Design a protein around this ligand. Sequence first.
Ligand SMILES: Nc1nccc2cccnc12
Lengths: 18, 353
Amino acid sequence: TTYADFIASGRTGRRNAI
Amino acid sequence: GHMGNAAAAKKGSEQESVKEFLAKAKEEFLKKWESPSQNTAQLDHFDRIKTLGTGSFGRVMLVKHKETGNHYAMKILDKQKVVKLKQIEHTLNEKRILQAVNFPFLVKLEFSFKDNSNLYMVMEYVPGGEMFSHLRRIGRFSEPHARFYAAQIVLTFEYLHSLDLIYRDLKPENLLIDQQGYIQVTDFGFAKRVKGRTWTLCGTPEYLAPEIILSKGYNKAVDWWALGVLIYEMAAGYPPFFADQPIQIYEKIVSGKVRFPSHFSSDLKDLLRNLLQVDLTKRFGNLKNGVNDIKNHKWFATTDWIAIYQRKVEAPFIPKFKGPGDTSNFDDYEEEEIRVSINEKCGKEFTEF
Ligand SMILES: Nc1nccc2cccnc12
């Protein structure tokens, strides 16, 4: 599922600005 | 048409009233953006309690004012690290805008000051925690729940943009939930007064509009794109463009393709296709009709805009709060000691703060 791919990615925590 | 004579008359009158409100709002703003405040307190006035959030250049801490007993949120930025990250302009923007704006969904700045090592901005403490935390915990919000929050962002952006301000860091991490269940926008690090275009590459990768990625000058339409990302993330549980490396995120953003969960309503997908619109000349919020293309979209048909602004609407939930100094709606961060150097650091860079 897309949600599982999301939790599996490195982008679920607080996202620093660029 | 879609509206009868009654609704058409009401809506037009509502639009005139918005214009009247915004003209008054701009007048009040212009005084403070010409003559800012400075040096409103000092560090020992405050007992420091716990870290509420950490960033690359400083932290925000829960503090208690000694004479008042009131709790505040104190943002502390290390002057040398700010200089080091070429964030001087942004920091001075944040302070000067925060002291000049006034809106129910914008965090209120109480004090600001500086010492040898740090800059300090003392804000009202918003106890219910970040939308980020509630969203990740619940997974996704229902559409009525997402719509309640989105409506508050639409109104906040209408206000900010009418003041020639762009926000540029919309994301759930920056949206706090207050005691009544309403949103407080915090962190104006990238907010800026802009009358034409601006050019800095800044923001958060998942929320960057295509024109930022393609290195063009851009304007307030990036905030409306970012609202499209926010509503998607709130309703889906994940943002529309993600990948482990920012460069893959950027590639998806500019392709002009977005896929939707099958539980999204058709009304929601139609709004999002118009916000997540790569073509600047077609993006909702950027057309001849301005924010009214958003406020009058079918997905917001049940939204009472004035009632939201007046905070008359019952919220989807009220955060649990067991006392005025309760931080249970916030994560735990490692505490570090605040050291104030014997020597003044970067004194000239921050003369305006
Ligand atoms: N004004 C605030 N209240 C509570 C928590 C906060 C976290 C980061 C920034 N501002 C905050």
